[PDB]
Design a protein around this ligand. Sequence first.
Ligand SMILES: [Zn+2]
Ligand SMILES: [Zn+2]
Ligand SMILES: [Zn+2]
Ligand SMILES: [Zn+2]
Ligand SMILES: [Zn+2]
Ligand SMILES: [Zn+2]
Ligand SMILES: [Zn+2]
Ligand SMILES: [Zn+2]
Lengths: 366, 375, 372, 375
Amino acid sequence: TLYRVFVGDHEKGQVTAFDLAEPDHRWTFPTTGQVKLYSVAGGAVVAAVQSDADTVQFIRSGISFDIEVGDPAAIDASLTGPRPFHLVEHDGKVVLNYDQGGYAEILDGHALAEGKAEPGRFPQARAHHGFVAPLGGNWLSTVASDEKVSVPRLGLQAFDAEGNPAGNLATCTGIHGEAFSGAYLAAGCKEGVLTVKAGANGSEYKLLPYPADLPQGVTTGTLLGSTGIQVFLGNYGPDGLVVIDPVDEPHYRYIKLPFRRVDFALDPAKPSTGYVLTEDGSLHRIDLLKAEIVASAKVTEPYSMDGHWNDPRPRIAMAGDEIVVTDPNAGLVRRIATEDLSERGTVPVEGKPYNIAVTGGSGVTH
Amino acid sequence: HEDVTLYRVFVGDHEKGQVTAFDLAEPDHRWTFPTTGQVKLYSVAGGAVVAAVQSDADTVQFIRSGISFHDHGDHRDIEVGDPAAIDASLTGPRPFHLVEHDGKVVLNYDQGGYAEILDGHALAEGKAEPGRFPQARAHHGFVAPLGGNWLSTVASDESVPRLGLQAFDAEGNPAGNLATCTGIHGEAFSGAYLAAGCKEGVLTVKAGANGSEYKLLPYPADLPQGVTTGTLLGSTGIQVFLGNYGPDGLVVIDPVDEPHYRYIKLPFRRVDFALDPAKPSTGYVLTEDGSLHRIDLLKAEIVASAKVTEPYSMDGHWNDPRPRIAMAGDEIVVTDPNAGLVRRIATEDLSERGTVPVEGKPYNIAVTGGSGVTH
Amino acid sequence: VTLYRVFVGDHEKGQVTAFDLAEPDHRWTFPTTGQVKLYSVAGGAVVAAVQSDADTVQFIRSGISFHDHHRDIEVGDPAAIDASLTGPRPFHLVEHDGKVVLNYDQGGYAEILDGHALAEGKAEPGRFPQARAHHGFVAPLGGNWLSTVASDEKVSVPRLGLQAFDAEGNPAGNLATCTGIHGEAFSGAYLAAGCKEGVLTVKAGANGSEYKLLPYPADLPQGVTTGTLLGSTGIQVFLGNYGPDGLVVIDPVDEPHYRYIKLPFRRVDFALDPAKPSTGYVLTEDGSLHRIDLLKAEIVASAKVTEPYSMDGHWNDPRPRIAMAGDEIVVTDPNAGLVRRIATEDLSERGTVPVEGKPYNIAVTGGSGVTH
Amino acid sequence: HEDVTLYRVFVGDHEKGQVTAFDLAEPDHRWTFPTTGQVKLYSVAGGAVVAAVQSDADTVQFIRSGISFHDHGDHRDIEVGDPAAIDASLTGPRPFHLVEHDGKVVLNYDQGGYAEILDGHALAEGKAEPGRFPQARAHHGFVAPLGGNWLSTVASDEKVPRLGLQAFDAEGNPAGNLATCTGIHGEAFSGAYLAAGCKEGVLTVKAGANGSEYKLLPYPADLPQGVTTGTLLGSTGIQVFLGNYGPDGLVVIDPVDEPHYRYIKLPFRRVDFALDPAKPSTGYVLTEDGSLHRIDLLKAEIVASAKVTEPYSMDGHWNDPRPRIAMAGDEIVVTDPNAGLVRRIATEDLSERGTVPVEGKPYNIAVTGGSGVTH
Ligand SMILES: [Zn+2]
Ligand SMILES: [Zn+2]
Ligand SMILES: [Zn+2]
Ligand SMILES: [Zn+2]
Ligand SMILES: [Zn+2]
Ligand SMILES: [Zn+2]
Ligand SMILES: [Zn+2]
Ligand SMILES: [Zn+2]
C-alpha cells in the first residue's frame, strides 16, 4: 500500500507531497496562493482551490486504481475566477462554486484524471457562498435570496445543465455544508438537516428538523458522510456533534465536546469510526455506533477557536491505519495511530503547514 | 427586523446603600435603587433579575433588569423595559454566598445555619418567597443544586471550621456520604462539573447514574506551599475552571485529565477576575498595579496587559474600596471607586473606549442583557 | 508564636550582638575575625557574616527554624558555626535556588554553599572559577551560574558584563554587555543587575538565559546609574538607587520600566517590606526614614529617626543600617550605640536597644509560626 | 537644456550624534555631519536645508543640503554642490516639533514656553537667526504660520493638559479666541487647510478675511471609540490628510466634503507612513511586521503589500530604534536600524531595488533634491 500526503502552507502558494511510509520521497508544487486541497477522481488528482487568489490548480497524485504508481506531476491547465470555494464531487463530476461570480464550474472526473480541466459553466441566479451537487442527473444548487446589502440563502434546488429549474426549491435557510452517504445527500440548515435521496422513483426531499432536546440557537453547518454505513457526522454548534441517521427516528444523537472543534474526519478504513480534534490539542475517536467519544489523546499544542476562521490551525486527514495532523506552528505533520492514538512519527514540512489531503491506498501490481 | 444588543450595568457603592443602573451604550439612561447597606451584586434568572446581597446589613434585595430573553423561537427574543425594584426582600442573619443552577437561586445565611431556595422563574416574575434548607450548623458556606439534590457545605463541632460537602434532600436529610473538603470555599460550574476549593485540592462532583460522582483533585507538590484555591470561575463555553491559588497566582483547572492544574504566576496581587463567555478560551484578571491582563485559558498564560486604573494596593482589608470587573459582550466594565467612574475596556485590544460617571465610590458590579431579536 | 531575632555587627570590632526583638535582654555575643556585613540566609536559619577586610566568612545558626509542616516554628539559642571560609576579600553574597554564593574579589573565584547544609551546620563550599579577579557576583539561575566578567584592562578592575556558566566555569552562552556591572537582585521571574547603560534583566528560558537590557530613559537624570538593587518577594518589582539622591521603581516587563523618585537628601540605606510587599523604606542622610509606595512610586510618609550622617566621604564609614522585623523597622545608630525600633504603621519610635560599641550592619531572622 | 534628477538622503543615527548624507543614485558620494545628540530630521527651505532637531540634547543644528531649486518661468533649475554644516546652532530646553509654512520655520521649545521663528530664505543662505514667539506656558506643542497669524497650541494652568489652538500675532498677543482641541497633537497642511489632532476629532483651519476660520471634524460614531488621531500628513494632490487613528488604524480626512473620515484597519500596528507627491492620492504605511502597504486614499484601502524589513514590534517606547520612511521620486527609502542600511523600494511594484549601507543604527530620515533642469 501507498498513501501520498499533500500538505499546503498557510501563507505561501506551495503544496508539499510525500509518501507517508517514506517521507524522504517528497515533491514540491507551486501554486498562486493559499490552497485548500481535495482528493478527487478516486485519488488520481488533488485539487488545490485558492479562494483568496481566484484560482484553482490541479496536481496528479499520480496514484491510479490494481494500483499504478508514479511520481506526482502538476497539471498545467488551471482555472481562474472570482473566489472559487466549495468543491463537490459526485457521479463522476467535480463541481466548483465561484462565490463572487454567480456560477459554478463542472469538470469531468475522468477527464481530469487524464490531465484535462475544461469546465462547463453552470449559471446561478445570484452570486453567493454556496455549492452545487450532482444528484440524479440534476445539479442541486444552493439558492440565495434577492435581498440586499454576506448574501442570505434560501435553500437548495435542482437545476438542469443550463441553470433552469428541474424541481421546486427546498427550504433550507442559510444552507451550508453538504455530504453524501449511501443513497443520501445531506445539507445543513437553520431548521435542521435537509436530506435528498436518489431513489428508484426519483429524488425524495425530507427536512429533518432539529429536535427540541438539542442545544438552542446553534446549527449544523459542516457534514461528513460515512462510506460504510448510511450515516452522517455533522457539527452542531462549535462544541457539539450530531450523528445523523437519515432514515429512522431518532434522526439525531448529540455528542458534547469539552473544547471547541478545530477539524474532523471519518475513517474510510474503519467506517463506524471518525476523529475530532479540539482546541486543547486533543484528538478524540468517535464511535458512530455508540454516538460517543470513546478515546482521546493530546496531539498538538492548543489552538484557540477564538479569532478568525482561516487563522493557522491544525488540519486532519486519514491515511490507512494513521491520522495525519498538520501542526502549523511546529512546522510539521504528525502521524497518529488509529489503533490507540499513539504518536508513530512526525514529518517536517517547511513553513506553516495548514490544509491537507491524502491519496492512495492498497492495491495489486503484478 | 433588527438584531438588538443592549447591556445594562448595575453598580453598587462602597459605602452607600445604593445601586446605580445604566444602559452601557447610552449611560444617560440610568436609574438608582436604594438599599439598606453595601451591596454585592449577582445577575440571576438569565439577567432578568439582579440580586443585591447586603451581608453586613442582613438582607437580600432584588431588582428587575428588566431585560429578558424569550425563545420564540427559531431564535431569541429580547424584551426591554425600565428596571424596577422588587418590593419583596429576603431577610436573615448575614446571607453571603449565592449559588444559581438548575433554575434555583440559593442563599447561605452565615449566622443562621440555613439557606433559602428561590425559584429563578418566580423571581423574574417578581416573587421572592423562599423555601428553607436546614443545616446542622451555622458557618460561612454555600448550598448548590446538583442532580436533583442539594449539595451543602458542612461544619465541624468546635470562624467555624468546615469539613466538606454533602448531598441532601429538600428537608436536609443526607442523600450521600460527606465528601472530605477541608475548609471548603468557593464554587463554580463548568460543563458537567461542580468544583469547590479545599485545603487538600479542588473537589469535583458530576451528576452520575447512582448519584453525584465525587473526585478530589489534589494540589500538586509543585504548587507554592501554604496557600489554596478559594475562588473559582467556570467557563460556560468550554469545560474548564479558573481559580486563584494564593493572592498572586491562578490555576487553570481541567476537571477531566492530567494535568489537573496549570499555574500562572501573577506579577502583582490579584484584585478581581472574570471569564469571557463571548471568547471562552480567554479570561481577564485585574492586578493591584492597575493592570488588566488577558488570560489564555488553553495555554494557561498571560497574553496581553494594559494599565486601566491607578494602583489599588492589596495591603489592608479585603473589602476596602477596590475595582471590580464584569463582562459586557466585547467590553470589560471596570469600577474605579476613587475616580467616581466605571471604565469601558475593549476585549479586542484592552483600549479604553470611554468612562461612565457614577456618584460616590462605585464598587461591586454586575451586568445584564445581551443580544436578541425584535419585531 | 512570633519571634524576631536581630543580629548587629560593630563598625570596628569583630563582634555580632544577637537579641530577641521583643525582649532585648535575651541576647548573645559572637566574636568574628573582623568587621561584618550580615545576611540572613537559608530562610532565616543562618546568618552569614562576610568580613571583606578580614578575608573571612563566618556563619551563626539563627537558631530559629521554620518546618513548613501554616508553618511550625522551632526556637533555640543562636550558636556559632565553627567552620568558616577564608579567602581573598570575599564580598558580594547571592542566595538563590537553595545556593549561597560568595565572590572573592581578589581571588578570581566564587564559593558555592548549599543552603540546606548550612542550616544543618555545615560549610563545605564548591569553587566556581572566574577568568579574572574582580569586584563581582555569581548568581544561580535556571541551572546556570551567572557571573560578572572583568575586562583585560590594566591594572579597581573594569567589568564587561554578565555571562552564564556551568559549575566548572565552562561558558553556557555569550557575555551580555553590562559595563561596570554592579548590584543585583531577584524578583519574580527576573534577575536584575545595574549597568552603565541601564539595568540588565535575565530570565530562565527554555534555551538558556534570556537577557534584556532596559536602557535608562533620556528623561532620567544624566551621568548617574543604578548600582544597588532590591527585589520584592511578594510582587515582581525592583527598587534601585539612581544616583546618590534618587530611586527608581523598576518594572522588568512593561513600559514604563523606570519610575524615578527624587530623594530630599542623599540615600543611606533602604529595604523592602516582606510583610507588606507594595511598600519599602529608605533612610536619607538627614536621618529621616521614608515609606515608599512601590505601586505609586512615591514617598508617602517621613519621620526623623537619627541625627544626620552625611554621605560625604568614604562609603564604609559608620552610618545607620536598616532591616525589617514584622511591623517594625530596626535602625542602627552607630554614634548613639543603639538599635532603634520604628513602627511601620506610623514611623514612631517604639524603643531602643542599647548595644556595645558602634552598631553598624544589621540583619533580622525569625517570623511567625505555630507551636504545639 | 538637460533634465536632471538627484535625490540626496540624510539619515540620523539612533544613538550617535551623527547625520549621514548620500546621493541616492550614487551612494558613494556621501558625507557625515556631527551633532550634539539624537536627531529628528526635516527638509526645509525647498530642501536646501536639513534641520536636525535634538530634543533630548536641547539643541537644533542645520545642514545645507545643498541641492536647491530655482524657479525659471516654465520650470525649475537645479543647483548641486556638496552639503555643508551651518555653523550657527540653537539651544534651548527641549526643542521638538517643527512647522514650515509661508516661508517660515518655527520650532517649539517644549520646556521653555516659547517657539523660535526662522526665515526659510535666511536659512538657505546659511544664517540661523531666530525670532522669539512667546507662549503663556511651556508644553508639548507647535506654532504654525497661517494667513498672517501664528497659530499656537495652548496649554492649561494647573500643576500638563492642552486645551486647543489659538491665533496670535508675532508678539504673542491673541488675535482670536481659543479653539477647543483637547490634547491637541499632530499637524499638517493640505491646500488651504491646517489640521491638528484632538480628543474630539480633527481641528481644521483656513486663512479667512476675518482671521482664522476654525471647523472641528468630530470623529464619527462608526469609528473605534476612545482612540484618536495624533499624527497627520498633508496631501499635495487631492486636498486630504492622512492621519493615524489608534495604533492600528488610519483615517483619510477630507476637510471640505463628506465623508470627512474614511477608516482603514491595519493588519499590524503602524511604524511610520508617507504620502507620494508624484501621485494624486497614494500613500505608504509601514507596519510592525515589516510590511510596506500602498494606500489608495480615494478608496481608503490597502491595495498592495510586501515585506521590506524584519519585524519591529510597536511594544515599548515610541522612540526605540525602528524603521522610518520617506519618498524619493519613484522610490521609497526605508531606514533599517538593525540592518545598518537604507532600503530602496520601488513605488510601482514594492520590489527591493537595492540597499545603501550606512554606519551605525540608521533611524530618522529626510530627503532633499528631485528633478529640475540644467542648461
Ligand atoms: Zn490485476
Ligand atoms: Zn462554506
Ligand atoms: Zn422572534
Ligand atoms: Zn466566601
Ligand atoms: Zn503544626
Ligand atoms: Zn559592590
Ligand atoms: Zn532653466
Ligand atoms: Zn509630539
